[PDB]
Amino acid sequence: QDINDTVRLLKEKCLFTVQQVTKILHSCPSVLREDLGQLEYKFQYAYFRMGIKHPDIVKSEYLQYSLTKIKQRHIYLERLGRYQTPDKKGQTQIPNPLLKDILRVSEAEFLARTACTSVEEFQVFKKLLAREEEESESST
Amino acid sequence: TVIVERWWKVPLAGEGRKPRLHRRHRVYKLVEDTKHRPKENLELILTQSVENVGVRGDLVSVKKSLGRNRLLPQGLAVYASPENKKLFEEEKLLRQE
Amino acid sequence: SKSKNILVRMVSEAGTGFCFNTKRNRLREKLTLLHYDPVVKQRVLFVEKKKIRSL
Amino acid sequence: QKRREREQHIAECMAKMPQMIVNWQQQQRENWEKAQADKERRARLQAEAQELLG
Amino acid sequence: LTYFSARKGKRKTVKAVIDRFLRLHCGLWVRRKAGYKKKLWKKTPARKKRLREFVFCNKTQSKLLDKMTTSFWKRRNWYVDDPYQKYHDRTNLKV
Amino acid sequence: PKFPAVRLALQNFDMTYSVQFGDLWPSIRVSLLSEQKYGALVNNFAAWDHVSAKLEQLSAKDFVNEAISHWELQSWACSPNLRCFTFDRGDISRFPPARPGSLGVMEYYLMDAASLLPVLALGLQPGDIVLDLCAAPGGKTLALLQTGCCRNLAANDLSPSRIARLQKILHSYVPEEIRDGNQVRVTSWDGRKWGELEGDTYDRVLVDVPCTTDRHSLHEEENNIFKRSRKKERQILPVLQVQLLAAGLLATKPGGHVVYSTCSLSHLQNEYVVQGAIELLANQYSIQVQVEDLTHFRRVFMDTFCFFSSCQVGELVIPNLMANFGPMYFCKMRRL
RNA sequence: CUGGUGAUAGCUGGUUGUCCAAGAUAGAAUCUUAGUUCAACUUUAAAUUUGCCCACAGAACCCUCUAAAUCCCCUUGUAAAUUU
RNA sequence: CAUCACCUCUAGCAUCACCAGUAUUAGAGGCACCGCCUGC
RNA sequence: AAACCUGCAUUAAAAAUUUCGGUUGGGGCGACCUCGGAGCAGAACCCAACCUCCGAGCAGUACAUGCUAAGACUUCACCAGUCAAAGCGAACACUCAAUUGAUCCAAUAACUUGACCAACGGAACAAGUUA
Ligand SMILES: C[S@@+](CC[C@H](N)C(=O)[O-])C[C@H]1O[C@@H](n2cnc3c(N)ncnc32)[C@H](O)[C@@H]1O
Ligand SMILES: [Mg+2]
Ligand SMILES: [Mg+2]
Ligand SMILES: [Mg+2]
Numbered sequence A: 001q002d003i004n005d006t007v008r009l010l011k012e013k014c015l016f017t018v019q020q021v022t023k024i025l026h027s028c029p030s031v032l033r034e035d036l037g038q039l040e041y042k043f044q045y046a047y048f049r050m051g052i053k054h055p056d057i058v059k060s061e062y063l064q065y066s067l068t069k070i071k072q073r074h075i076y077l078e079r080l081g082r083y084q085t086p087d088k089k090g091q092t093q094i095p096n097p098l099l100k101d102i103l104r105v106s107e108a109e110f111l112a113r114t115a116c117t118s119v120e121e122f123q124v125f126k127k128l129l130a131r132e133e134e135e136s137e138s139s140t
Numbered sequence B: 001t002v003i004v005e006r007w008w009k010v011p012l013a014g015e016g017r018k019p020r021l022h023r024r025h026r027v028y029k030l031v032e033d034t035k036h037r038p039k040e041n042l043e044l045i046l047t048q049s050v051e052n053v054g055v056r057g058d059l060v061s062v063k064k065s066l067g068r069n070r071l072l073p074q075g076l077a078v079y080a081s082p083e084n085k086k087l088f089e090e091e092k093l094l095r096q097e
Numbered sequence C: 001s002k003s004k005n006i007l008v009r010m011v012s013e014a015g016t017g018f019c020f021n022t023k024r025n026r027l028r029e030k031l032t033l034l035h036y037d038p039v040v041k042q043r044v045l046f047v048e049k050k051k052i053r054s055l
Numbered sequence D: 001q002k003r004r005e006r007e008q009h010i011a012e013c014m015a016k017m018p019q020m021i022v023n024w025q026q027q028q029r030e031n032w033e034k035a036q037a038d039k040e041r042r043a044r045l046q047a048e049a050q051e052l053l054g
Numbered sequence E: 001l002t003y004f005s006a007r008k009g010k011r012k013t014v015k016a017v018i019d020r021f022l023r024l025h026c027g028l029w030v031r032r033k034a035g036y037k038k039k040l041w042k043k044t045p046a047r048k049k050r051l052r053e054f055v056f057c058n059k060t061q062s063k064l065l066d067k068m069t070t071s072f073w074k075r076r077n078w079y080v081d082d083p084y085q086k087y088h089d090r091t092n093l094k095v
Numbered sequence F: 001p002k003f004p005a006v007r008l009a010l011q012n013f014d015m016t017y018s019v020q021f022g023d024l025w026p027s028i029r030v031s032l033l034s035e036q037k038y039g040a041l042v043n044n045f046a047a048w049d050h051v052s053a054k055l056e057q058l059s060a061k062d063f064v065n066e067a068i069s070h071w072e073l074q075s076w077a078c079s080p081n082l083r084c085f086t087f088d089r090g091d092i093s094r095f096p097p098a099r100p101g102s103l104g105v106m107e108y109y110l111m112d113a114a115s116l117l118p119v120l121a122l123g124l125q126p127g128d129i130v131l132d133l134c135a136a137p138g139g140k141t142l143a144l145l146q147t148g149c150c151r152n153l154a155a156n157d158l159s160p161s162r163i164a165r166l167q168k169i170l171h172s173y174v175p176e177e178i179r180d181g182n183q184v185r186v187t188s189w190d191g192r193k194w195g196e197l198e199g200d201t202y203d204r205v206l207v208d209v210p211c212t213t214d215r216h217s218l219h220e221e222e223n224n225i226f227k228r229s230r231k232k233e234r235q236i237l238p239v240l241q242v243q244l245l246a247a248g249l250l251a252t253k254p255g256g257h258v259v260y261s262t263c264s265l266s267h268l269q270n271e272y273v274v275q276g277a278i279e280l281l282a283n284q285y286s287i288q289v290q291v292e293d294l295t296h297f298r299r300v301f302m303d304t305f306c307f308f309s310s311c312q313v314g315e316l317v318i319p320n321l322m323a324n325f326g327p328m329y330f331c332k333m334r335r336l
Numbered sequence G: 001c002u003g004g005u006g007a008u009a010g011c012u013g014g015u016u017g018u019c020c021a022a023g024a025u026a027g028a029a030u031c032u033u034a035g036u037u038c039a040a041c042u043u044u045a046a047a048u049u050u051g052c053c054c055a056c057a058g059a060a061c062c063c064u065c066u067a068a069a070u071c072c073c074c075u076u077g078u079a080a081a082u083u084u
Numbered sequence H: 001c002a003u004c005a006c007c008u009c010u011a012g013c014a015u016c017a018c019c020a021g022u023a024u025u026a027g028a029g030g031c032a033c034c035g036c037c038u039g040c
Numbered sequence I: 001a002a003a004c005c006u007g008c009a010u011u012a013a014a015a016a017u018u019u020c021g022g023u024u025g026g027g028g029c030g031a032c033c034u035c036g037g038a039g040c041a042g043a044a045c046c047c048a049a050c051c052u053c054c055g056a057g058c059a060g061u062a063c064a065u066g067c068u069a070a071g072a073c074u075u076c077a078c079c080a081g082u083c084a085a086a087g088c089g090a091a092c093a094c095u096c097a098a099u100u101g102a103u104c105c106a107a108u109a110a111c112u113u114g115a116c117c118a119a120c121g122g123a124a125c126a127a128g129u130u131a
């Protein structure tokens, strides 16, 4: 039933195609170990706040990465203005950085390629973001 | 067994008269379901030797899932009725004598 | 509408059980007032015991 | 018994109360005195900055 | 108000009046002050003094409460050591 | 609800400030969206010596004292008797909430460290009379009283609601003996009247005109300047800044100094307003003023602040991730 | 279609002998302004004694000054007024 | 609107529809043939 | 061993009941609803809605800011609100124009406390649209 809930959450809650579900399980086996609540939050974060559709999530191996590093890199890019959240129509003012650039690239190289910020500045943001996230859990 | 109780008080009917039930008196609240209560042990008098006790006429207590399923249908045990105890008491008395 | 003050309850040290509510600054130590106790008909020491609400 | 127990507790507290009030009153003056003493110390320290100039 | 009950055919009493008001047999109605237990920390002692006292209703309110209660509440009672016993009759009242 | 005022404020800033700062705008934008670092301003009236020791235990460092010793190293000075403790660069640590001392007054005040520079740039001297326009809620007003160099003060802000907050701040921090006399005067009147009520009265004038506060606009949802109802006020906001600064300039005596401070990154409200007042005085009242150079001031505080070096007259402190103080713009102009 | 059902309608319409008598415009609250409740006004009965009209006297300084007047009100002319 | 054609989605199976059928099948849908061009 | 059934929980599906608070020619976008003051009825009181403009949803000092009690005021009703001699008890009716919220209910040994119920005399909890 642990496996059943994991796949059913992807198929029903996350509305993933059965073909897409098999690819995710084959490529990212950490999904089964991951908790259902954290996994569901990770998916909807990319779908709504980031604007990534279902086919891109499967192909980009998004679900395998840690949720925390996704928050740190995406929000920093969003606050930098390099990343634009798609509107209702789905259009973006500026082409958003590709998901492979954000996550697959190393932290030091990621800043140079897209963020264009020094290493020291990003370190302060993570501590700031962690405090905001910690207060977020306590507040909610 | 589902044991329920009425949310609303039922007015007293009197002596020799039936209570007047209202539409609101059909609202019940669950008090206790007897299926979720701790089990009890059935008291039986053994007739033939068993793994737990091998002495005929020795009163034993086991789970109701064993006496009802195995001991009683197979004739291994009998109910611990007071009359049965008196009959087996005489049988034990003859053994001592 | 920041809560600068809080409502506290002062309990008499005379053992009569008489208590009254007073307003004090949140950023302050526990008060020890000298209030009139009707039970003993004289002024007695009072001590803050529990905060009621934040004003 | 409940009336007597409450009455005895009131009497016991009232016995220690005059000393408690005096101690509480004394503590108020001591804190006020120490704060007053620090004000004198700061005035000397503030004067020292002007003293170095002159 | 139920002027005729469905089972006895007689006038009923509104229980919201019995739990709030007291009727002196002379005809007066005694009530409490609205808010004598609410936010006492922000009220002056003079204001609280006149809040924890019992007052009388006026002509219109007393007439209203008489129609909302039956005769069982307008009868003369003889409770032993009743706090309001001496208030059931008017003294030296003219017109 | 409906359209968030935060997004409307961010949209207006994004178009305007991208051109002005270029590649620096992404760095500024993150700092603006992040929480600003709070500096601890020790109350001189309270146990300043004890609190200074207490803050040093929390790894806080007095940058003002460090900046004092740097005046001789680099080779009007600045307002003395100011002690503000901040953390190291890149430290997100927050100060504990302030507490009353043995004297009954709060030991220190938490405020932006970039807001102290207009007080520092004012170059306050003992025995002077200080006029502060839009003094409420008292961020700069408290610092002036901490110095003790102002015998007479006039704190005027148009909004009585802001003024009432200022008096409570003064009561909690400033002892009543100073406030008892006519030393501190608190009024709620238009600052444009001060150019006629009291001319040449004050030697030091600090004019912090109302403006779109970038830090507050992007976070606060109440009374935002960028909401639809406040659009008319925002359009006439540059007009008010020119009139209020001009009134403060006329209020000072010749030979005095006036510091114009603004909490925004908009050039239309920082440099254009300064130039507008200078032209306005000459055309209508024939008044000439000289803007002093703040480059020497900048080089001392470069360690603890980030500065934008493309300003015509004033000095602009831009927010940064490591140094979140700002945004703050201040220009010191003296009357001749 | 029948029944609940004589559903409900702050809405529209209607409301049937004779004669006489007294009788119109302050407001407040309200999911309220097409309504209702209280007050005012009006009616009847009762009780009581003053009611109206009004001679002086009297009713704030301000922001510098400034209207017709109003309140109160003994006499007097009158017969009402208050209360239940 | 439907329409061949194309496309998406779901389903590995029987004794009352689908079906006395079995993924070259069945169902739920989009679009409206074909031909050319294009995404990936 | 396993299933079915039953009871109780947890998601989801599909449904079920109910409602669209007022003010501003209409719509859009916004503002407004309570309390205090002014233009505002020049002289007892009251009274100009809509409108124009500025505020208030506090804070501070007390800790007898205790307890009782004649006579009055009153925002045109009610609710609510306001002043107060004397007296007991102490000492030798706090400032402030507004600075506020009923009942039920909940918590508590008692005392007492709880709503931007701000649609501010307050429905325990309900949107949009119909060409
Ligand atoms: C951006 S705040 C600056 C506050 C203060 N100077 C500080 O930094 O701590 C500007 C304030 O000026 C006030 N203000 C607006 N218009 C004014 C005017 N015309 N005359 C005087 N003050 C005004 C506003 O109430 C506003 O709170
Ligand atoms: Mg009977
Ligand atoms: Mg009808
Ligand atoms: Mg109606």
Ligand SMILES: [Mg+2]
Binding pocket: none
């Ligand atoms: Mg007639």
Ligand SMILES: [Mg+2]
Binding pocket: none
């Ligand atoms: Mg078609």
Ligand SMILES: [Mg+2]
Binding pocket: I074
């Ligand atoms: Mg009245």
Ligand SMILES: [Mg+2]
Binding pocket: I119
């Ligand atoms: Mg309402």
Ligand SMILES: [Mg+2]
Binding pocket: none
């Ligand atoms: Mg209302």
Ligand SMILES: [Mg+2]
Binding pocket: none
């Ligand atoms: Mg009212």
Ligand SMILES: [Mg+2]
Binding pocket: I131
């Ligand atoms: Mg049509």
